[PDB]
Design a binder for this molecule. Sequence first.
Ligand SMILES: [Zn+2]
Ligand SMILES: [Zn+2]
Lengths: 245, 195, 114, 91, 118, 120, 209, 96
Amino acid sequence: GAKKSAIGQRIVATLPYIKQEVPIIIVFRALGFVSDRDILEHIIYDFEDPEMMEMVKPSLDEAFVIQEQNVALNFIGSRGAKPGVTKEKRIKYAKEVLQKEMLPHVGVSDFCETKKAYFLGYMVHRLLLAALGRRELDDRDHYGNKRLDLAGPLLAFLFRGMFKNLLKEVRIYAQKFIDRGKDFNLELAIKTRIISDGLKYSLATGNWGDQKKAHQARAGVSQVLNRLTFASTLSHLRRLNSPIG
Amino acid sequence: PILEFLEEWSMENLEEISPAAIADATKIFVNGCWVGIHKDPEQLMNTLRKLRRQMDIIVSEVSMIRDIREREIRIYTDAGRICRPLLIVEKQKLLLKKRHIDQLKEREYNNYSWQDLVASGVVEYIDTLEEETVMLAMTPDDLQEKEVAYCSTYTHCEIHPSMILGVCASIIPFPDHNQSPRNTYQSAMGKQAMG
Amino acid sequence: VGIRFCQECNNMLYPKEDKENRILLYACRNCDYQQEADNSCIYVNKITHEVDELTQIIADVSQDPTLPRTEDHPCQKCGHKEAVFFQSHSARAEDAMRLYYVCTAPHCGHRWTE
Amino acid sequence: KDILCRLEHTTLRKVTANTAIYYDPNPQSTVVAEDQEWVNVYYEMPRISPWLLRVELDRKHMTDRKLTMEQIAEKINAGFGDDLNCIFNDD
Amino acid sequence: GRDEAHKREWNLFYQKQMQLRKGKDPKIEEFVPPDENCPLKEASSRRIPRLTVKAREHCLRLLEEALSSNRQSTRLRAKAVELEHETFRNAKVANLYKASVLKKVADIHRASKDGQPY
Amino acid sequence: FIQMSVQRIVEDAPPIPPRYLLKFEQIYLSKPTHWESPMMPNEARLRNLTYSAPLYVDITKTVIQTQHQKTFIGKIPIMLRSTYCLLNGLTDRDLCELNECPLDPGGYFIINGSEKVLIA
Amino acid sequence: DDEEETYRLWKIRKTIMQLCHDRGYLVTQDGLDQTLEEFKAQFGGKPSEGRPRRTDLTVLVAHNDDPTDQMFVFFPEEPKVGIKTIKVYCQRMQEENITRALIVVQQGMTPSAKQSLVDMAPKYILEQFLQQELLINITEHELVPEHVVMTKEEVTELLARYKLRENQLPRIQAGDPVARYFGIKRGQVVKIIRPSETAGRYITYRLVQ
Amino acid sequence: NNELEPTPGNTLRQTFENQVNRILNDARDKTGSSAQKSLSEYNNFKSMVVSGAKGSKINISQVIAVVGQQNVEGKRIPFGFKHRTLPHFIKDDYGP
DNA sequence: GTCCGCCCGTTGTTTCTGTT
DNA sequence: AACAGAAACAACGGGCGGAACTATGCCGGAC
RNA sequence: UUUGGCAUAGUUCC
Ligand SMILES: [Zn+2]
Ligand SMILES: [Zn+2]
């Protein structure tokens, strides 16, 4: 059709915990930047690039409507996991998502917007460079783009959940024993069986996860050591794995 | 410590930077988080490599990459990167010397070892995506020497090219006279022999 | 061609028609700021786009240890002998194997292609 | 080669060199100086909108397929009818 | 099926935009008949819409002026009238008629520059 | 993992009319022991036991302060030959005394007698 | 162009002549074999504003076994043939006392017109052929073996000889290109004669169903 | 030097790669033929190849003369690193 | 002893023309 | 204007090698 | 002279 044919390409962002896609200018405005000049300062670093400017123009043509942080936040939060019946709660949910689940590695404090905007602009800039044929697309098989989860990371990820469950159980016990108002004890509130049995089970079976949820748990970690020959033992102890089906 | 050194070494931060002084500056990423910009990338890289070789501020495990064309410096302190040691070639001569070799061959009753070799700045750990900015030589006394010039700017050297094989494939004799499926089959059958 | 911004709201200036003086005006959708442009051309689309990378080649590539070097191609400006060289290094190029050169003398940065 | 040309699809992008949209209300005083003579010759012997759609055709692709500007013009007329105007130079 | 759908959507869009540019009374330009001295073949023919007799007379003068310039270079009315009439007979629309006349004028001028009789 | 990650996981956990509040301070790890007494890896293999060490934590109880030290929260399996095993740093003669092979590389867990290996 | 339009009309006419000759109708050799220049001379070399106007090219021909059984080949001048056009053609057939007729279409027929063609099947038989489907003769393609329409007598004899019920023969759809070329209804049986690599010839049979 | 002219129906990269692969295949086949015709009447490879028992002239050629080109997915070895096959080569090296 | 990763055949939805 | 025949696009569901030999963990929880 | 099952991992052969 005529309008799609004239627009060509548009840039959209798939934020986590949001029902469907969002145009990028909406997210940038939700961060608190209103002026197209400022948004293009965050995205296009050198303004003497007319091809990049023309490429980003159709993305800015979706800003014809949205012009303010409040309405941008409303538009973002309209598509939550459970859409609200009110509007203030939806806007608070939108702000919470943009502060907690979008780019956690940049920051989670209150004043992290000035850096989240720069990093999101860098993502968009790299996308533009890829679309213009100025940088090579990445390949997933390159080994600089990989990490290896050894015993440290594996057991730490496993232990986080068990400590969280232990905290939940002691919290439940404390509340139940305190609503009576009589007293409260510590040793009786802690179930060591949680941690002990969880670690022992995950190491014994190989299903990396909780016992109740051994369906999506990735099986194949924690194999039983090969002892046919010394070379077999060594080559078993130095072994990798690609989770591809 | 890396962030502190970066601050000490005149690295302008993002919130203190006008969006006009970024076109001609090379962005700095630390653990994938953009922390600032710098205007002297070459001297910055020289200083960082010197500090890593001295083992003073930056541990030997940390990797540093400079993307010269795209003007980016990436420093990783992450866990899970895979790396292997390489010898260092300064101009065209290995920094490894006969004094190092003798002190190593007197290793007993001398408390001189691999750590004391690393601390001298002779060898180095290179991970996979730092290998993309390095020039390697397979054999010193064959590739550093004067020839019909192929490359005169070697940056590292291999210890021995036969260290590319695993545990089970290090027992095959003359694997370079074999066929690759045969080497794979022997790697499989080495775990089934009885001894 | 390029993007020009209003001085009041700092938004993109769209082209608007002045049906009285037969003139072109750039106006924004936030305020009533008007302007008169000198390009006189709203839109330009070149589909060949065989851009010469000499604009896009940085002079800092001369410090790359992984690039080949030659001494049979002296620099045009400073007459330095050694000069790094490489290929197009461009995606979306249908066909190209032409070489590009960069002088390795510091602060020269001459980037030509014979 | 003639049958090869007849049996291979080809739109205008395969032969066009560049295109642009101008604002030129004056039939005589044309923003582009190249078209002056023949555009004046066309207009001297006769409303309209002041906007333009100026395209440039690549010579190599134009002459490779043995195409002709009259053929392109008549194809445009067939495709859009007489609600467009078309004026073309020659080789 | 997608190309056919896009072509239909485009045709509807194009027709809508052109109807918004069509005024209520398209004045049908009145066909003025040829004068008694009109040298054109089939001068009263209305076969080409919006092509007037005065346009064809102008096109004929361009052919005469070009042929006159050519003959002066190489040391005419009948030939100009045949060239016009052939171009008229082959053309279906006024714009293509005009373009084919201007092409013949350019070909005559090329022959004159090459010192050749057209 | 044992040195840093468990401590970080404990610390980053959020703390949980009269009011009660708790805050876990720091952890501890003794060498592996058996409860019916250090437990050697060979005995763990022979008796179908699990080679593991107990993890303690300091928890502070406040009412609106009272400190509880060495709160036992469970047993953590120990990797062989690692810094927190009973074979760490021993010489070959001691290894032979404990009926452990001096050539054994280590780096595996003993879970219910069997020997487990984590795969990267 | 006028040359291309003349060429298309000539090719369509030639293919229809071949179709009628295959269907057993009586078409002479000179009608079968016309050069492009002969067709230009006989019925206009100028289509646009010329004598051939997709009319006067209609063909009326009588079957070799019955001059009373005749067929029409109509050329609608409309890109989309309509209900009223079909009614006009059926009226002409009724007045000329003609049972069967062919209709070559510029682009296509509306589904309403197609259903209004199907409805009168026992009264009249009309078939639709697109303009593109007749620029070539599919029968002449080397991938297509010879087809022969078999009489009810030949069918009965074949069934008795092999002791077959008609369910037990291979089938061919009534919308098949060759089936439409031969004008075969459901229940008729065609015979396929083709050379073979291991026998030298092999005769198959297909049931139209 | 841009003096290479493309072959019709092929890109510049395609024609360059075709010429290079053709030259290398000619070299491998010529060395193989030399190795074959330099055998002896007592050679056991020849005994097991001529009689059709097991082996082939290409196997004899790979044993004696040249193993030959290695291909991945039908093309030459790709550029796994940034514009080079291994860290031991300069960037943009198309030699054999 | 009680309670807790890719292909392609169906069917729908929606749309676009023809008849009376 | 109402109705009807045919078609473009979208969503859904089933389908994905053959044999054979070892081993190990587990088959519900609180009161 | 009588008969557990579910899951996961590894290996052999085309
Ligand atoms: Zn404004
Ligand atoms: Zn220079």
